[PDB]
């Protein structure tokens, strides 16, 4: 059965982006997987996406613009202190220049760079670069 819906969504984005597609259809969706995508919009790794309303869980159609190399999900959502950001950057990111680690914190779902500036910690969700 499907266990993690966010890990499902990021795996279908990353698979269709290495195939060079123009759109993906993501099923099912959540509040978490749209808050992950809006982090990926703000740093322009994806384009506009659209949530279709069923009275079920929704579907998302994401427009890809060629910029994303890999997005993935860290499972389980390991707890990450503020001293631990430089440890997670060296492990899953290709460089310190680019690439983001998305965390779910008390302040919201943010990338690692914003959470370092607001002096907060959280559980790690995933990454995109």
């Amino acid at each position: 059965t499907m266990m993690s819906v966010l890990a499902n969504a990021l795996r279908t984005i990353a698979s269709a982006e290495r195939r060079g597609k123009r759109q993906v259809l993501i099923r099912p969706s959540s509040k978490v997987v749209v808050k992950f995508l809006q982090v990926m919009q703000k740093h322009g790794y994806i384009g506009e996406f659209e949530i279709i309303d069923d009275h079920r869980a929704g579907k998302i159609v994401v427009n890809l613009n060629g910029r994303l190399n890999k997005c993935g999900a860290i499972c389980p959502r390991f707890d990450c202190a503020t001293t631990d950001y430089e440890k997670w950057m060296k492990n899953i990111l290709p460089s310190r220049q680019f690439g983001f680690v998305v965390l779910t914190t008390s302040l919201g779902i943010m990338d690692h760079e914003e959470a370092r500036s607001r002096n907060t910690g959280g559980k790690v969700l995933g990454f995109f670069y």
């Binding site: 060079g20 613009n65 060629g66 910029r67």
Partner: protein, 88 residues
């Protein structure tokens, strides 16, 4: 303004390379199937001008068979090739 800089604002890298116009894939130096295609811009009397529209396609996209679908999708976007007939 493309390529990495120095914190003194001098363009540090050699060779900012091309990118595929279909897949935004950075074309490498050994990708010997990667082609540029120059399409002549033509005037109102149907004779070519001195300007051409050049579009470059990566080598793996030609390898699969998907280049010809990509040249269509580009030239509709550039406005080079019409998408359908006019109404009769």
């Amino acid at each position: 303004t493309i390529g990495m800089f120095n914190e003194e604002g001098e363009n540090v890298d050699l060779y900012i390379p091309r990118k595929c116009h279909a897949t935004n894939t950075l074309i490498e130096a050994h990708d010997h199937a990667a082609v540029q295609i120059s399409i002549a811009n033509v005037g109102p009397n149907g004779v070519i001008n001195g300007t051409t529209t050049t579009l470059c396609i990566a080598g793996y996209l030609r390898s699969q068979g998907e280049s010809d679908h990509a040249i269509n999708h580009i030239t509709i976007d550039r406005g080079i090739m019409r998408i359908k007939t006019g109404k009769p």
